[PDB]
Amino acid sequence: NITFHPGAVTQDERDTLLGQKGCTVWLTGLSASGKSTIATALEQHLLHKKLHAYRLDGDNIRFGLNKDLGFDQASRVENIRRIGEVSLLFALSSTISVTAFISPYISDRQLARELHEKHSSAIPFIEVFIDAPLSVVEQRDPKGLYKKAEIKDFTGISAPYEAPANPEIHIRTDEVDVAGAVEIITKYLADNGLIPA
Amino acid sequence: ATNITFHPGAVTQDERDTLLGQKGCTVWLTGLSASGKSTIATALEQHLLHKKLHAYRLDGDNIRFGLNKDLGFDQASRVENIRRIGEVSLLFALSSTISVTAFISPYISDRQLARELHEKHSSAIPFIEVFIDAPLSVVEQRDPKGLYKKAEIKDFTGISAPYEAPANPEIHIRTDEVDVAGAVEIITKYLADNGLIPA
Ligand SMILES: Nc1ncnc2c1ncn2[C@@H]1O[C@H](COP(=O)(O)OP(=O)(O)O)[C@@H](O)[C@H]1O
């Protein structure tokens, strides 16, 4: 009982068979703003809804796929480029891809977006501004990164963060808790047809 | 009214596999040009999707001009091409997806490095190496893109560069003896026999 047409499955075929549409949920924000805390909680929530969702962050990218990359300007650009391509591949597989990198530069995030929006069939790219004040992330500072200021070119302290002008989702994590941030993102996905009811 | 639950930290591998009713793995196809990797990969992916299983094909169409567009054709580029593909296929397996790679991957050391990414991973991930084995005579008869006839093309695997055949892979399929549906049946049966998809 094995059936297939010649060639590759189309995107509509895959989406229909798996009962799910792929997209990229692109988190951006300062260190300690809550990207990682929100991404792992959102991923679990979606998995409880029987949805394929997968988090991309430093833990599974930096020392594997991108282990060849340094911290010079060219390396940083290439790091985001490759994360953009990988996130697109996950979306093409009918998975909700959640990226949790500071991604400070407008141009880098824009090129990741264009890979999705210019894809032969356009793939949703949902930019989520995880927005916490500098005073809040310095008070949080769960790794001591802000106190070191012994660390150079640090986003928001000694390097620039380029805030998105008008992202698809804007979440102020000093006024919404983790569950509320997960609720906001999931409701956006549901209201835009990307996950079932 | 909401309905949200989660524990601190990341989902564990067993939690993810259980919630999704599926275990992730890499099905690594290797073989000569025109041996049937892409033909089998697209049929297999369709078959698994029909079983409501996440499966995803990695090949030249979605890798070469995207993630790996920076790479050329020198030996160093070639090694790096397979290296990255090994990492990406691992990420898909970690997502509880059946990742199917369809690259010639002619060198034993490159396939071995990809394999060790899976087998030495903190939680070990199955790496299923499938020798798509067709004689030089058959693939020269097939030559669906004229690649073997060009000989015009340099350092071509099986003609002017080596193919290092797997010694004893998890699956060995002679595509001059089995049709595409039978090749899909063998791989799918192996997946079920090893608990990676429901029976
Ligand atoms: N609403 C919220 N969302 C996310 N994190 C929060 C929130 N409120 C407080 N925090 C705390 O802020 C810190 C954010 O750390 P982390 O998720 O590692 O941020 P990032 O990945 O952006 O560097 C965590 O200690 C978290 O517990």
Ligand SMILES: Nc1ncnc2c1ncn2[C@@H]1O[C@H](COP(=O)(O)OP(=O)(O)O)[C@@H](O)[C@H]1O
């Ligand atoms: N039993 C078989 N398995 C796979 N392909 C076959 C088989 N018999 C004939 N073919 C043909 O051989 C060619 C294989 O092409 P392709 O899948 O592109 O090989 P590769 O991906 O290894 O370069 C296709 O034309 C396909 O129709």
